[PDB]
Structure 1
C-alpha cells in the first residue's frame, strides 16, 4: 500500500539551510528585470501619448499657414 506520514507537530520539513539565501537574490534579479520591462512599456506608451501633443500643436500652427 501507499504510506502517508500522519500529521504530528514534530513532523519536520526536509532540512533547508542552503535553500533561501540564493533564492532571494535570484528573486530580486528576476524582480528588477520584471520592473524595468514594465518601465520600458510604460515609457513606450508615455512617448506615444506625448508625441501626439506636438503634432496637435503643429496642426494648430497650420492654422496660420491657411491665411498666409
Structure 2
C-alpha cells in the first residue's frame, strides 16, 4: 500500500533529518594546553626545593661531625 509507505517515509524524513546537527568548540584545547605548563612550573618548584634540601643535608653532615 502506497499510503503507509509514504507515511513511514515522511516520519522517517522528520527523525532522520533531525539526526543531523553536531557541535564542537576550540577553547577546551587551549585550556588543556595551559594546564600542562602550570603543572610543569609546579613540578619544577618542588624539584628545586628538594634539591636545595638535598644540598643542605650534606652540609649538615659535614657540620655535625665536629661535635663528636
Fold shared by both chains (TM-score > 0.5): yes
Please state how far the C-alpha of 1:22 moved relative to its aligned partner.
2.0
Query: 1:59 aligns to what?
Result: 59
Which structure: greater helix fraction? 2
Instruction: Name segments (4+ residues, structure 1) moved above 6 Å.
Output: none
Please state how far the C-alpha of 1:43 moved relative to its aligned partner.
0.8
Instruction: Report how many aligned residue pairs link the two structures.
Output: 47
Query: 1:41 aligns to what?
Result: 41
> What are structure 1's unaligned runs of at least 5 residues?
1-16
> What are structure 2's unaligned runs of at least 5 residues?
1-20
Give the structure with higher Rg (CA): 2
2:24 corresponds to which of 22, 25, 28: 22
